[PDB]
Design a binder for these strands. Sequence first.
RNA 1: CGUGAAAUUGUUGAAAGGGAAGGGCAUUUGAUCAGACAGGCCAGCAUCAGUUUUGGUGGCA
RNA 2: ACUAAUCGAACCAUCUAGUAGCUGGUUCCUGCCGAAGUUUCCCUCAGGAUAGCAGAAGCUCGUAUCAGUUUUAUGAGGUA
RNA 3: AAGCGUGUUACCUAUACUCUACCGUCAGGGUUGAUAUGAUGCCCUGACGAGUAGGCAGGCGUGGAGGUCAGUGACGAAGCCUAGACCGUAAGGUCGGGUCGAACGGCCUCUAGUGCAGAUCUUGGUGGUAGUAGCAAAUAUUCAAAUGAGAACUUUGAAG
RNA 4: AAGCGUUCAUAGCGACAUUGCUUUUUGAUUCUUCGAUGUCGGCUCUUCCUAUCAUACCGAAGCAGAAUUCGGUAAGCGUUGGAUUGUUCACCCACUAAUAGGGAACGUGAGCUGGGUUUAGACCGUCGUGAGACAGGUUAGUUUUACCCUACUGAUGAAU
RNA 5: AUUGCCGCGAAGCUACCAUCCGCUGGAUUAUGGCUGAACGCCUCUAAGUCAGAAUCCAUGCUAGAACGCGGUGAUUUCUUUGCUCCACACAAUAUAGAUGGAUACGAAUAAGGCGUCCUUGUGGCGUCGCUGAACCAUAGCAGGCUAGCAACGGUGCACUUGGCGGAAAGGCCUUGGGUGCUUGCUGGCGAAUUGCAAUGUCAUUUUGCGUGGGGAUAAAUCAUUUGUAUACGACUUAGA
Lengths: 386, 197, 114
Amino acid sequence: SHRKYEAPRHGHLGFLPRKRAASIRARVKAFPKDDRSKPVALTSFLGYKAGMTTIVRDLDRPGSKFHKREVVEAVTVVDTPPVVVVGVVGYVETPRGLRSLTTVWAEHLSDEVKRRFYKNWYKSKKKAFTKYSAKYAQDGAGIERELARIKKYASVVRVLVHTQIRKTPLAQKKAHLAEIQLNGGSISEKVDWAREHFEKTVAVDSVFEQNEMIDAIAVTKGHGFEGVTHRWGTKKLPRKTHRGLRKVACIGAWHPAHVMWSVARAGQRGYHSRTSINHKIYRVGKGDDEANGATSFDRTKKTITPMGGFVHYGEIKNDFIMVKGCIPGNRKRIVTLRKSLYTNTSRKALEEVSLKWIDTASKFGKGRFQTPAEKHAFMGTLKKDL
Amino acid sequence: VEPVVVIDGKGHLVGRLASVVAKQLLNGQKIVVVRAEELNISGEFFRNKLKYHDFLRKATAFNKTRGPFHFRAPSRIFYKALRGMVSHKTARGKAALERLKVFEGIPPPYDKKKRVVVPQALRVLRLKPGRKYTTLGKLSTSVGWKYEDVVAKLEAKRKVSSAEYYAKKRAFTKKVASANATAAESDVAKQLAALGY
Amino acid sequence: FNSSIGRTAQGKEFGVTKARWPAKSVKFVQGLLQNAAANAEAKGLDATKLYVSHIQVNQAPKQRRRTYRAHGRINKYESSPSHIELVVTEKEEKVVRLTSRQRGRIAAQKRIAA
RNA sequence: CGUGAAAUUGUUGAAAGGGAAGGGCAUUUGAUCAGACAGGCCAGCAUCAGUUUUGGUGGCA
RNA sequence: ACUAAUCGAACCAUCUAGUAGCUGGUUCCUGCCGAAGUUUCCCUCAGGAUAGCAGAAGCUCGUAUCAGUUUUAUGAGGUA
RNA sequence: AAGCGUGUUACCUAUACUCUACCGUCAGGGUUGAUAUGAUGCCCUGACGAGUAGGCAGGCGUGGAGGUCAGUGACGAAGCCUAGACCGUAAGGUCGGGUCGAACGGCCUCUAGUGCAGAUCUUGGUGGUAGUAGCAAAUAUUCAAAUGAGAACUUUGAAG
RNA sequence: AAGCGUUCAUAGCGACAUUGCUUUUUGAUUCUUCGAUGUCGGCUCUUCCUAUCAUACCGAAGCAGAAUUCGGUAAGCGUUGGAUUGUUCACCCACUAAUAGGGAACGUGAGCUGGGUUUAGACCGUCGUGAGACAGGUUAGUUUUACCCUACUGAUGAAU
RNA sequence: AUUGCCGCGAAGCUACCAUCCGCUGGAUUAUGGCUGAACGCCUCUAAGUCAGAAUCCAUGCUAGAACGCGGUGAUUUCUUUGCUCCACACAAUAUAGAUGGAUACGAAUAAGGCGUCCUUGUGGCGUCGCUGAACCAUAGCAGGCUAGCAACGGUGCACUUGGCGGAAAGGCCUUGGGUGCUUGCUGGCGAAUUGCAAUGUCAUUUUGCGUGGGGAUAAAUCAUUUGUAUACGACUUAGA
Ligand SMILES: [Mg+2]
Ligand SMILES: [Mg+2]
Ligand SMILES: [Mg+2]
Ligand SMILES: [Mg+2]
Ligand SMILES: [Mg+2]
Ligand SMILES: [Mg+2]
Ligand SMILES: [Mg+2]
Ligand SMILES: [Mg+2]
Ligand SMILES: [Mg+2]
Ligand SMILES: [Mg+2]
Ligand SMILES: [Mg+2]
Ligand SMILES: [Mg+2]
Ligand SMILES: [Mg+2]
Ligand SMILES: [Mg+2]
Ligand SMILES: [Mg+2]
Ligand SMILES: [Mg+2]
Ligand SMILES: [Mg+2]
Ligand SMILES: [Mg+2]
Ligand SMILES: [Mg+2]
Ligand SMILES: [Mg+2]
Ligand SMILES: [Mg+2]
Ligand SMILES: [Mg+2]
Ligand SMILES: [Mg+2]
Ligand SMILES: [Mg+2]
Ligand SMILES: [Mg+2]
Ligand SMILES: [Mg+2]
Ligand SMILES: [Mg+2]
Ligand SMILES: [Mg+2]
Ligand SMILES: [Mg+2]
Ligand SMILES: [Mg+2]
Ligand SMILES: [Mg+2]
Ligand SMILES: [Mg+2]
Ligand SMILES: [Mg+2]
Ligand SMILES: [Mg+2]
Ligand SMILES: [Mg+2]
Ligand SMILES: [Mg+2]
Ligand SMILES: [Mg+2]
Ligand SMILES: [Mg+2]
Ligand SMILES: [Mg+2]
Ligand SMILES: [Mg+2]
Ligand SMILES: [Mg+2]
Ligand SMILES: [Mg+2]
C-alpha cells in the first residue's frame, strides 16, 4: 500500500554513481562559449587549494538590513602561480563529436612536466620528447606544417598548460598538465597566440579579475567506504533495533524482485568530481608583493599567509585567487577555476567588492594575533633567549 | 550484382527500406546506407515524436543501464528498425548485421561511389500525395541527437565539391557524346545499328 | 582454490588479483625440489639445464578430528593432506593420390611452363 | 599390501565457451576407424518402367 | 508442575513385522489390444460390493443374426 | 498499408491424403507319391499400426540345478577400464586393446532371496559450499640467552 | 432533463430513468499453497498511478474588487508537527502553499518492533451439573540462520 | 584503578548547531490567436501559421562503453644478436563466401534531365524518360611464339611534376618521358591423350621461418616511500 507519509527522497540522483573519480584532477566538461570578437584569452586556470580564512567588508546591497554595514565572510585561497604553455591541440567537428586532429608541443619541456609522462622517473632515461624536439632542428618545418593544419581545420583550439608545482610548498615535484580552451579571435589567431606563448608563462591576473564570478572544478575530499546514514542522509533507526540501526530498513518492495538503483546503499563517499559555480573573486593577489593580506583600510604590511603557515599547506609565495566561500576539494588538491559559463547579472554578481580586513591569525589553534609584531606588542618581552 | 551496395537514404520510408535491407543482408549482400538523417517516416512529426517518447519511457526499472537503450541518432533509429527484422541473437543474424553500415550524411569513401535508391521503399512512390510524413533528422534532434548542424555543414561542403565534379563530368560526357554522334552514319555504326547497338 | 581470497598487488605479474604466500606448502615443495635436485646430480644430470617438467599434487587420505557445535552437535574437523610428486628434466635442444584429370593438368602446366 | 569400479580429485593432451549446461534432425570442419580387386566406392549418358510436376501444340462438342 | 536434557501418565524389553478406507515407493525390452470417474446397495461421501467399459481364453458355426443409417407404412409425445 | 470490407488467382507447408519400399501385426491362401530334406518351415495375397490405468504375448539379462558341447582357461578364467570395431528396433550380445591372476561359458531344460533413479529409502563412500564461517569473554605482553632441524608459545634470567 | 436556481433546464445543481468504469471496500467462488509463501499495526525506504489537495499556465461563472466555485493540460515538484487509541479507521489541537487519494504479495518481520490477534499461567462476567465455552473484558508471556546465487552499492581486473 | 576522575584542550572528523553554492535555451500541452477554405457569409483548422505550462529535449551537472573512438610521447644489442620497416622465398593458418567493373551532381516529383540560343531568367526553343533489358568492358596456351600494315590513339607497369581532399581525409585529379601489350587491320606457327564431365585449383587474411637492405637504442610492475587515497586491491607522491 501507499507510503502513508510523504517525504522527499534522500540524496540527488543526478550525482551518480557515487564512485571514485577517475583522476585526482577533475576535468572541465564545458568551456565558456567563444566570442570571436573578444581578444584571445584562456578560459580556465590551474591552481592548488591552500586553505580558508575570514574577511570583513562593507556590503553594497540596497534594500537589505546590512546595506553599507560590515559583514564577515569566509573565503578560500587558491595558490595560483603562472602556468606554462607547452602545447596546442586542434579539434575538428565531426558527426560523432569533437576530434583532436593534431597536437603541437613546444621545443623545450621542463622537468616538472616531463615527470608527468613517467611513473618511475628516477630510474628512467628521460627520453620524453627527445625525437619530437628535433622537429625544430633546421627551421621547424614539421612544426609549422602541423600548426598550418590546425589553422586550416580545427574549429576548436585548446592550449596545453602545466603548473609550476615547484613554486608550491608541495612535495609532489610533478606538474599537472591540462587542456584549457582558448577563446577569442579567429582559429588562426588562437594558433598564433598559442605558438607565441610556447615556453611562456601565463599569469592568473591575465585570465581572472576581481569581482568576477568563477566556477570551481575539483575532486571532493575522500572518506572511503561510508554507511548509508552519512553517505545518503537517511534516518537513523530506533534504539531498540536488532541487527543494526545505521541502515535503511526496507531496501525495496517485494516486486520488482530486485533492489532499485535509487535505493540508498553503503559505498564510496567523497573523491567525486564536482563543478561548483558562482563563486565571487574577492582578490587577485600577486606573490611578489608584501602586504598581500593588507587592504586600503588596514595598511598592515602583511601577506595573505596565516601565522604558522596555512595548515597542511604552507606559505603563499605566488599569485593567488581569493574566492568567496568554500569550493570542493581539500588543501593541496589541484583545482581548475573556470570562467562563468553564462553572463550573471543577479546583483549579487556585478557587485564591486572592497575588503576592509583579512584574517591572518593562526589556523593551528585559536589564534589571537594577526602578525608577530602585534604579538610582540601585546605580549611584551619573553624569556626566550636572544 | 555489386559487391557493396550503397543506398541513399533520402526520401525513403524507414520501415519499408528496413525490410529491404534486412532481406538483402540475410541473403548475403553487403549494404551501406548513407544520408540516414534524410529518411522519412509516414505520419506527422508529432505522431512520431509521441511514439519515440512512448519508446523512451520503457526502461529496466531497477537499473536503467541494463534496459532498452534509446539511441537518438537517425542511423541508429534506422538500425533499430532493421534489428527486429533480423534474428539478431543468432550467429546468422550477427553475420547479417555485420554486412551493414548506416551513416549520417555521406562520409568517405562513399562520397565518390554510386548511390542507389530502393523504389520499392521510396516515399515519393509509396506514400499517397497529401499524406503527412516525418524527416528522421528533425525527429532525432527533437529527441536528443546533437549533430544535425555539423552533418548539415559537412553535407553542404560535400555537395559543393560534388557539383564541381559533376560539371567536369558533364563537360566530358558532352565531348564523348559528340564524338559518338559524329562516328554514327559510318559503315561500322550502320552495321552496329542493324544489331540493336 | 581462490574464492573469497584477498587481493594483492603481487598478483600483477601473473595477470591476477588473488595471490597468497602459503609458507607451509612452499617449505614442502622446496624440500622436494631439493631432493629431486639431489637425485638429478646423483644420476649425473647437469644442474643448469634442469627444469620442473612435471609437478603433481593429489589429495591424501583425510585425518579426522571433531569440532563441537551449538546444541550438543559434533562436526568433522578434517585435515586435507597432500601427495606431492615432481620430476625435473634436462632441457633438450605421404604419397598424394591424383586422378587422371589432375595428372593431365599437371603435365599440361609443365609443358606450358618452364 | 589380491583385484581395485563409481562418486570426487591432480597432471598432461584435445576442444568449446558475450547471463547456465545438457538434448533432436541435418550437414561442414577436425580427429579417429572397419572392410575390399580372387567387383569394392563414387559418378555421367541412353533407352525404359512406376509415381508425379511444369510447358508447347492438334482435333472435336 | 516435577519424577535422571523424557511427563495431560517416566524409562527398558517383549506381545510386535500391532492395525491403517491414509502418504510415499514398487527394479528389463519389444509387440498386440485397450479403459473408468457412471447404475444400485452399504455408519456409505478419501472405502467397498454390484453392473458397465477392458483383456485373455476360446467355442458353435460360415455371410447369417444383423445395423448409434435412411426409405415406406403405421404409432406415440404436449416441448418450440 | 504491411489497416478495414470484399473479389480473384498464384504460392508456402502436417506425423493428414496418393504412390513406392522396408518392419511388425492380423486375416485369407499355397506347398508331400524328393515338399528338390527348416510344415511352430518356406511362400502368395490383402488390410492394418496413437495410447495412461490395465490385460495378454514374444523376447533380453542374473544366482543356483539336471543334461550336453569328451566347450574355454596360467600359452591367462573371471572382474574392471576402453569418444576402437561389429550384430540386434530394443532388453542386450559379440570382438579388439589395457589391466589382471584361477576359474568360466554356449545350448536344451529346472529353479528363484532374479533386473532400480527415485521410497525426507538402508549402509558406506564423496562433493559444491570453501581455504569460506570462523579460531574476538576472563586487562598483557616484552628483551636476551640456552636448547633444538625448526622457538610468539620450551627452559633460565631480566622486565611489565 | 422534470425541476432548483429572483426571471433562466444545463453558471452551479439536478428528480424519474438509464449506460458504464474501477478492483485501495465487502460479499460470492475454492483454482494455487496444509512434507508451512511468517500473521495485524506502526516504524524505515524506494518507486509507480492519477480519479489533482498545493504549486505552473489556462478556459467558465449568478467572475466589479477580494474571496471562491466548475473545468482543461499537467504526477515536474511537495503533501506536516501533535493529544487519545495496538489500531487499520477515526477524532480533536496546530502549523501550512497543501495537509489529495491509492498501488507495489492488503510493498516492506533472515529490516526492526511485538502494543493486537492467536499456545500453555491467572482473574472477572454471562453460560455450562460438570469438564469446560465466549469474533467479551484483564494481566504475563524465547521474534532463529545469509558466508551461496542473483539484484543492488561501491571496488579490482586478463586480453587490444 | 580494564581510558581512575575533573578543567582546558590543538589536529582530524563533523552540525540548518556552522558557511558557501544550486545554469539558460529550444520544442511543445491546455488555451488564446493569424491567414483561411470547406459552406460566395462565417470560422484558430482543413492546407499553411503565431504565442504559449512547474511539461518534454537540450545547455549545464555525474559516470564513461571495462569488446566505442581520437591525438600525442618514448619504445629495450654491447643483454643465449634482440626489436621494427621494406623486398623476396618457403612453410603453416584460416575464409558468413572474388569469380569482368560498388559505374560519385544537387534538387523536384501537381515535376525534372540534357542540349542550344539570348535580353543570363522562376527565360525562349528542342529533346529525353515510360527503367540498369543500361553504359563500360569484353576475341588470343586462364590467353602462347612470331611477321607486317595503318594510326600517334587505347591501356598496363614502375619512375616522376604539380594540385586538391580531415566526416572515417588514406583517395581523386594531373604532368613528363621510359619500359610492355594492343583484337584498329592482314598474316605464319603452337595446342591433341585431363581420354564423353568431376572447383579441376588462378582469390585474399593471419602467423611463422630464412635471406638481404634501411632504421631506432625504452619502460612498466614488484619491492621501498607519501597520505590529497584507502577494507584489500586500487589511488596519489618520492627515490641513482
Ligand atoms: Mg499518498
Ligand atoms: Mg528486540
Ligand atoms: Mg573551501
Ligand atoms: Mg585550524
Ligand atoms: Mg533490458
Ligand atoms: Mg550518386
Ligand atoms: Mg543524455
Ligand atoms: Mg570474509
Ligand atoms: Mg565449537
Ligand atoms: Mg583388498
Ligand atoms: Mg591393491
Ligand atoms: Mg572416477
Ligand atoms: Mg560472466
Ligand atoms: Mg545445439
Ligand atoms: Mg517415366
Ligand atoms: Mg510398525
Ligand atoms: Mg487401438
Ligand atoms: Mg446400516
Ligand atoms: Mg489421495
Ligand atoms: Mg404445453
Ligand atoms: Mg412437460
Ligand atoms: Mg483485403
Ligand atoms: Mg500401439
Ligand atoms: Mg547360472
Ligand atoms: Mg582375462
Ligand atoms: Mg568412459
Ligand atoms: Mg591365486
Ligand atoms: Mg529382491
Ligand atoms: Mg541407486
Ligand atoms: Mg522409478
Ligand atoms: Mg576467516
Ligand atoms: Mg519458508
Ligand atoms: Mg488527468
Ligand atoms: Mg503485506
Ligand atoms: Mg522476524
Ligand atoms: Mg522480508
Ligand atoms: Mg503482546
Ligand atoms: Mg551471503
Ligand atoms: Mg545479513
Ligand atoms: Mg480573421
Ligand atoms: Mg559526464
Ligand atoms: Mg573506457
